[PDB]
Assembly symmetry: D2
Homo-oligomer: 116 residues x 4
């Protein structure tokens, strides 16, 4: 599991389920190329985004559709989405967990990076 | 103003107004003695808790009554309070801003420490 | 697993390993009775603190020794410890995950509460 | 002052000083157009980015150059930048404070939205 995303809900004290996100990789012309995507499970986790061989050096952007999540709960949010932009695999493969904790007007994000 | 506390509401995107808090200082017998108390203003800030002369070296605890805050908004929150425990003025007088960002099931707290 | 604590390190991007903590339960005289304790594993997690039958209604305090964690890394921290105080099991058993994300001058904490 | 950004350093317990950031606004063709830029002061705050007349309805992005900040302190951070994307002034003019709390592998961001 080279890249996993975990999302939590700070209002309900629960995993954030069915949160959609796309992953992009920065292209040579500075545009964002589609790379992976999915929705969080009932555990708030999204596994299986990529494989070790496909996940090479680059700048990656995880764009998490937090706005649709809050609107489904009938809550008006601040952000259009939560974006996480980072260089990955510059020193060869690593395993990355991107975590996000969501509130309607705030989010926090952290990374856990491990050498396989 | 050597000690200031600022509290923000991550659900509503606003200062957390009229939040009560109590400050304690550890006594020689290791019990918590009352030190100061107050409530946040319309800006979410509590100023004037202490003075340079009174705010001596010690271990201090700020106990923020987050539970009453959420209950008054019709939210049943997770925590009884948000607690911040720290040694102050160990290397001479400093000015401390304690900030807290509140959600029903989560809080974040940070400190800004400056040398006058 | 009625009560689990997970701790992450925001400076190193890693689980916070070997973080010691004690759990207390508030007694009828408002004192804090010892309840459980342990240290986080290499995954940053502490499992096995209690059992469903022992973990009944009460106000619980998880006192996480963040200061010793940072001092072992040669980093001077702000807080004496990170405290998480919450009522548990007031509506019968639940499963609780307490998570904390640590920085030298800040911490964030959230809860995931699930009905078994 | 309809838009202000405040940045704090969770490692040092200080304002994050001399942090560069760029603000963009989504154009009719869905591209990001430059809107304003600046750097935080000794208080960690960036004031004067825009005016009430210029700060019309739209989708805005604040891109905070956290990577250069950490690198100058000798830290190799995780994120390329901290990004905040939001719709502004949808229901008439508001005043926005965007706050960010920075660690090498994590950031938290919140908004305070007030009606003048
Ligand atoms: N994370 C955080 C916390 N915190 O205690 O973690 C407190 C406040 C906060 O926003 C502000 C608000 C005012 C000044 C600086 C930062 C954030 Cl963004
Ligand atoms: N904010 C935060 C907190 N927290 O106690 O606030 C704890 C953990 C965390 O990342 C994770 C990491 C793994 C699983 C769930 C969340 C974040 Cl992002
Ligand atoms: Na001293
Ligand atoms: Na409108």
């Amino acid at each position: 599991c080279p890249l996993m995303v975990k999302v939590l809900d700070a209002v309900r004290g629960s995993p954030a389920i069915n949160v959609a996100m796309h992953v992009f990789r920065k292209a040579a012309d500075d545009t964002w190329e589609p790379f992976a995507s999915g929705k969080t499970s009932e555990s708030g986790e999204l596994h299986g985004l990529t494989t070790e061989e496909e996940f090479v050096e680059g700048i990656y952007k995880v764009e998490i559709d937090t706005k649709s999540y809050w609107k489904a709960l009938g809550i008006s949010p601040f952000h259009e989405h939560a974006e996480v932009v980072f260089t990955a695999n510059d020193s060869g493969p690593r395993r990355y967990t991107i975590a996000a904790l969501l509130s309607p007007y705030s989010y926090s994000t952290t990374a856990v990076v491990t050498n396989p």
